[PDB]
Amino acid sequence: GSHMGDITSIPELADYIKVFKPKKLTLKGYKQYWCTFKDTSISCYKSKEESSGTPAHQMNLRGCEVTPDVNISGQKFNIKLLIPVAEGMNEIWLRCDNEKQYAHWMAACRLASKGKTMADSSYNLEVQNILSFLKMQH
Ligand SMILES: O=P(O)(O)O[C@H]1[C@H](O)[C@@H](OP(=O)(O)O)[C@@H](OP(=O)(O)O)[C@@H](OP(=O)(O)O)[C@H]1O
């Protein structure tokens, strides 16, 4: 809602990365979408136009399971996004794009696990940790 508390989305976190799923039926996978962490639920827009700008997916997924495995040797970042649900498990994995990428979602994703987003000072240590390897060697 929007009356006494929960005025707006206190925790703002958003970025654009690639996503690709095996799809249960067929679909097409491979899509550029910019999701954002609102008050306590997520939102998804593939085109601010959508004729009305209304997002296609909007719900509180949370429980995102993150697996950190990024070898800087070839500057290869590989984070798999898994989420348990009633149907079973939504296997999802986003593609890499630049160190600035892992810092935004890899951290938020982790936080998003405890339910909150990068609104915790702890996340600082998560992003401050990755960029630390760059200082050591590109
Ligand atoms: O537009 P089409 O070709 O139908 O495909 C989309 C994409 O698969 C979306 O992927 P992403 O999750 O990266 O946004 C999402 O898949 P999922 O269904 O697995 O969530 C949409 O869910 P639906 O719009 O609810 O069908 C699906 O419709």
Side-chain angles (χ1 to χ4, degrees):
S2 61
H3 193 143
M4 284 285 243
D6 286 65
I7 323 91
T8 70
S9 47
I10 341 196
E12 77 198 315
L13 174 279
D15 195 276
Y16 56 98
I17 68 276
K18 321 284 141 64
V19 52
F20 163 32
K21 281 88 78 225
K23 314 305 191 299
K24 359 187 182 197
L25 207 85
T26 146
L27 276 50
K28 34 79 233 173
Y30 270 79
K31 183 217 294 77
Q32 257 285 269
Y33 78 122
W34 22 56
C35 31
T36 150
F37 201 109
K38 102 200 307 82
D39 307 38
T40 169
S41 286
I42 298 302
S43 305
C44 165
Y45 323 72
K46 309 177 200 182
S47 292
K48 85 298 296 212
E49 247 69 79
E50 279 192 69
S51 210
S52 289
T54 271
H57 247 135
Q58 180 166 212
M59 40 183 297
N60 196 172
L61 293 148
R62 102 201 182 198
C64 31
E65 223 184 344
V66 306
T67 297
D69 194 283
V70 43
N71 301 335
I72 60 93
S73 195
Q75 319 308 146
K76 2 178 197 180
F77 340 138
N78 202 235
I79 192 77
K80 91 199 296 193
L81 217 308
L82 179 61
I83 280 156
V85 307
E87 324 204 82
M89 321 183 210
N90 281 312
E91 90 189 279
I92 293 170
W93 348 276
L94 54 91
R95 206 194 324 285
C96 46
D97 200 75
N98 36 42
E99 37 172 284
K100 300 125 186 166
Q101 186 182 324
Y102 256 42
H104 291 61
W105 281 92
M106 110 185 271
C109 299
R110 202 189 199 83
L111 288 268
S113 198
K114 39 180 64 32
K116 236 291 196 306
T117 332
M118 59 92 93
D120 202 298
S121 316
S122 173
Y123 109 111
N124 291 267
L125 271 64
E126 303 178 10
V127 320
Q128 291 279 31
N129 256 276
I130 319 310
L131 260 159
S132 198
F133 287 77
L134 285 280
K135 307 187 176 286
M136 295 280 157
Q137 58 195 144
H138 300 328

